[PDB]
Amino acid sequence: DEDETTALVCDNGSGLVKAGFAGDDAPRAVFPSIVGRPRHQGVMVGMGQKDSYVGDEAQSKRGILTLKYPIEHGIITNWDDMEKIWHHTFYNELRVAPEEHPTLLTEAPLNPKANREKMTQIMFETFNVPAMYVAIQAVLSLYASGRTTGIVLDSGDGVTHNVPIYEGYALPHAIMRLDLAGRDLTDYLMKILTERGYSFVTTAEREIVRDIKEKLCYVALDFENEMATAASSSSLEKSYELPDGQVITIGNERFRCPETLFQPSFIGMESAGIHETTYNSIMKCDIDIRKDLYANNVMSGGTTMYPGIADRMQKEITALAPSTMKIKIIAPPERKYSVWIGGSILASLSTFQQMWITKQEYDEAGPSIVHRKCF
Template structure:
């Protein structure tokens, strides 16, 4: 179990040593700010205390009677009780009305009642989309609410993950929100790939982190980052989910059209899809994603849908969607495949370091849990890498949480206070403080 933080000191008080704000002495909070899920907990814990879906639900039906599981409560329906305001940004008619007929929900309650809601994800490809910052604030507020961490954001330093090559405007807006709206006392941004290496216990290696929105390869040698060798590609789990919808429509005639049904496609991906050990031929894709006269197309297994019907899925139906990770051109994308991004990252390093990196490849991120993913990456590395190099791939069982675990380790160190930027420093120097600190 996570070790609970010590009770927060009174807000605004000063410590007895050096006049340092008391909030800076409290246990830091670590948030892995993912496109699919938010993982949150206190530094020093072995695993995130709370895993919250990164989704916002806007009720699409009018309430006509009181009661029910979607009755208002301070931690579920943010209308009228949110400290950041009760209006909903985005499409008119899906947010809160002046009469309170339409509500906004956040967290697990959205997943439980998704069929009654229009579901939105504030983040795409690792960054908050324009017009979705109000929803992102709602998610962060939910993290600190009584239902989850149950502590004010103003009482704890914060470590927040940030994907490589995110726009500087994204960090600026996130910093303004966390410092001005949530009054966070100190903030540090960390790259998920480096945190995952922390979690693996290595000081040398290259992390292939494949999440829902993007993938990136981050090499580190003896604790030294190689920023010129970091490679990012915008291919991830969301592309596999979209391909599941395409496969089901073209091979089975089953259409998943609503935002809630998109979440169903995501579940199908997580439960039955796998990565083929060898590349699928392009002909299979052109002829209809599994409508082929071979064993892979004829052998089927049922998948039970929420309405009680069983959807028959062939082996090719289950393997085709994941192929987008290894050959994005099949969907018309010019992005690098995850294997190509890994090889490109290693080749950008000095020639004397490449063998060490190839011997210490670490997988991280939820999409790498796809059955057969590691074997396929290994096959691609052997095909495209040096002929006589030794290749070793580590796939920790907890790799879906490895970025958070690494952040927990980092934020629990006594030197973490030398890494963060305090609210006072930011108020004095503005966004330039990140450049001055080398962050």
């Protein structure tokens, strides 16, 4: 339905897929990274009913479906479900057939190689895309935020890569990859809501807790003092309407969930938190770089939308940082959508038009070409 052969951008996270065309300032549509399947025996004849549901279909019919995510901690393992999501995304809802448009995909720099190789293979072999480019989230986040220099701490759904960039250059020895993300924060919340009498264990229940989290949780700039009153009074609780007419309120669980970002030990991870990893990515860069990264701490990914996160992270780094240095956080409304936006920016830059793999080079080399041409 587009009137120009622009590139397509599709940000396939472990959570949701943001997609639209290159050159825009927003995805045109957002689909979950989900393929749903019925977990019940059909009773009635002539009811239609699919073997599998894709994207928004999977959530729309979720009452009797188990919902699976093809991407685990940022890596695609179920390429067949990815192809279903992409076909739906590109042909039914975004109305852009990849055959007529080059496509840009996104990923952490330490995302295992199979991710970038398989994504490249599917767009060239099942979609016949004329060209491909797998982009890095740290690059995409600095473009979206208007920076060339800074720390990208993407507190997304899958894995946090924590990658410093200076004057457009990677500083790879200072990358701190952390096995903590939004999906784990949600799981922690489900266990503590169980402690309060609200047990959520099935798919519909899990998707609901994620929605509750997104609307009710906040980080708190002082966990212990906030907990001292949240755990003592209803005055710090917030309600949520459950789809069936029941209601839930959340107390210290409201902040304990995001607290895992500062205390990963809450989910069994051996880590001091996202602010220590951010601190180390600044600290491990050269001494003449450190000052610029302290002043350009970039929050990216989702979870950046928990109230107070932009401020607590500046406080936590300031507390670790040397005096004299300016510590500052960048946290635009283009949060959580920053990787997709960076994709749009990058795909359409004149400086990027030589970075695309065409469907010539691809067949001569095979999908492993992504490791030579993209990253």
